[PDB]
Design a protein around this ligand. Structure first.
Ligand SMILES: Cc1ncc(COP(=O)(O)O)c(C=O)c1O
Ligand SMILES: *Cc1c(COP(=O)(O)O)cnc(C)c1O
Lengths: 358, 359
């Protein structure tokens, strides 16, 4: 039995993949794949509408937000955000609490002079994040940009933002759909599809409508929020298979009880794994408890000379893609929505009996 | 049997789809889909390298061109072309002979003041194109941009360019890999994958290496050819499944005998279908002989009030997605690489039966 702990692209719900396999060649009796049909067919149109509706229901998006499906991954959004949003102004506030937040800053430097606010705390060797209340924001920022779940670091910011009428932008790539969020606190939420949804080549953007209409002329059109909104995300040919699949994944999410039920399953999973790490000195995670990601769980061995053996023996027991980042070394288990608790139990059994042996 | 004449997204080769179906859930024995793994895995990196290599061999790409796999579709290249290539030049030459070449112009207006050369001819009701010899090009232009196959109009420019040290950019979306081309005559070739590869969500860009490094600062990194090239199209997460499938397409092309065999097959398929249109007054095509696309074949009926019955009866026989464009009405058959001659035959047999009835 195989479990795939890959950080992105990532496991898809087993049931979504089964259904997709089933209809790969004959979709809805048409004798063609979903992949070979026009995005303007009645049939694809339905997928496009059902999936927007299903997403609004799951996350409870208000009517004043546009729901866009975009080419280009989240790194496109690192450019598309400043281009759409800078408006008449000359910078925005960028909250820097890890790699991906840093990445966005580095692209922002093409379009502005980003005000880099470092938010990382280091109390007792543990790494955490400053409370929002003390973040040193500008009066003049076009917006405030932050990453609520840092996929490499295993650091989440769980608190909802309650800033002014400041425009908040959040890269939710690696934790979107993991629990409910209060969409109304946000200007833009974006997420590359390939992590906590699963399929690569699609990016989700959710945009408050009043923010449209101020995009810079240099912004290529396929990344213009207004243009996408005016064309129901079909200004050009969309990544249709990816969109159909994300639609399957929204269906599956509703079958499971929605994001209230995802929150419970995901807390249960994280507590299991973090528990297995914390019971013993043999493994270590050095993120502050309050800021621990449920989605991405990095960890190291007291004795790092065992990493390779740990990874090879895990893989032989079917536990795949657990290699950590170069900097930390050690391990990272990403345990997204698709990952059932039995997946995580298999990993922690394995961790236990690896410590027994060595 | 179903045959699917959709213009884009389009039919994939049947054998590619039977293979993908069989490994959808357990690829390579790993117990997982190719959709579910790192783009930085040895397994996916092997896919990436092989695909690039099979492409180079199929088209005979020379050593000094980069092969890039990109997000965004060809509409993204309408911006990515000017931003990558303008340098300190104010304008670029835009050859205009139809819809898709027109669309490139409007996007380029964001970045430059394009020089719009109207290249269409009109003789007898027959639409055609000026030979490249007489194209009124410009000396100060950053490059020349044209579309050798206009998907909606059914108009192709077969002539390979022979301009001097001018940089030629071409939108080969609807005919890349239909036949051999002399890649050395171009600066940039690009193509959305959804047609004559077939899989949507990936775009091909072939760029002469010396053209890299003049990118404007405003260009989003994911669209910067030099960045793509420096990172082998894995600057960000690629459309893994799409790229894989394209790779299957490349292998399939190789098993069929390469682009020289495609040319013969595609020739014979067009000849059959244009044969069915020409031999009777019931169907019509108003594109000059010399400019007739082999890939997209619009055509109308003498009596346009049969259109619905025709489309409807064709569908009942397994012939799908043949509706034309509304300016023209009538029909359009796209008959890309994946489509076998048998497919085109069922359409011409159908066309004959229908004319027999209602003619
Ligand atoms: C010749 C041509 N160019 C461009 C495009 C647009 O491609 P996309 O919808 O990927 O931006 C199409 C479709 C096409 O057929
Ligand atoms: C992976 C990741 C990105 C980059 O995603 P791409 O789709 O490869 O551009 C950005 N932000 C976060 C939090 C991520 O995990």
């Amino acid at each position: 039995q195989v479990y795939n702990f890959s950080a992105g692209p990532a496991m898809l719900p087993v049931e979504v993949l089964r259904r997709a396999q089933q209809e790969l060649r004959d979709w809805h009796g048409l004798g063609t794949s979903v992949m070979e049909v026009s995005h303007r067919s009645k049939e694809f149109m339905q997928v496009a509408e059902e999936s927007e509706k299903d997403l609004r229901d799951l996350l409870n998006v208000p009517a004043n937000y546009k729901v866009l499906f975009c080419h280009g991954g989240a790194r496109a959004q690192f450019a598309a955000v400043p281009l759409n949003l800078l408006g008449d102004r000359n910078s925005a506030d960028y909250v820097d609490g890890g790699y991906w937040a840093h990445s966005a800053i580095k692209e922002a430097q093409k379009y502005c002079t980003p005000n880099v606010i470092d938010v990382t705390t280091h109390d007792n060797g543990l790494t955490g994040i400053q409370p929002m209340k003390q973040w040193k924001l500008s009066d003049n920022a076009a917006y405030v940009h932050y990453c609520p779940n840092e996929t490499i670091d295993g650091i989440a910011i769980d608190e909802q933002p309650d800033f002014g009428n400041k425009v908040v932008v959040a890269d939710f790539s690696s934790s979107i759909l993991s629990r409910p969020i209060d969409v109304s606190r946000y200007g833009v939420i974006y997420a590359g599809a390939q992590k906590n949804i699963g399929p690569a080549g699609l990016t989700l953007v959710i945009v408050r409508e009043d923010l449209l209409g101020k995009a810079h002329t240099a912004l290529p059109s396929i990344l213009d929020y207004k243009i996408l909104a005016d064309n129901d995300s079909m200004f050009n040919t969309p990544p249709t298979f990816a969109w159909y699949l994300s639609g399957l994944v929204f269906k599956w999410l509703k079958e499971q009880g929605g994001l209230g039920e995802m929150e419970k399953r995901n807390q249960a999973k994280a507590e299991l794994l973090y528990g297995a790490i914390d019971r013993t000195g043999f493994y270590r995670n050095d993120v502050a408890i309050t800021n621990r990601s449920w989605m991405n769980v990095p960890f190291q061995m007291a004795d790092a000379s065992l990493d390779k053996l740990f990874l090879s023996e895990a893989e032989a027991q079917g536990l795949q893609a657990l290699k950590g980042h170069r900097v930390a070394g050690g391990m990272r288990a990403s345990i997204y929505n698709a990952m059932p608790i039995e997946g995580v139990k298999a990993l922690t059994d394995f961790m236990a009996d690896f410590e027994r042996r060595h």
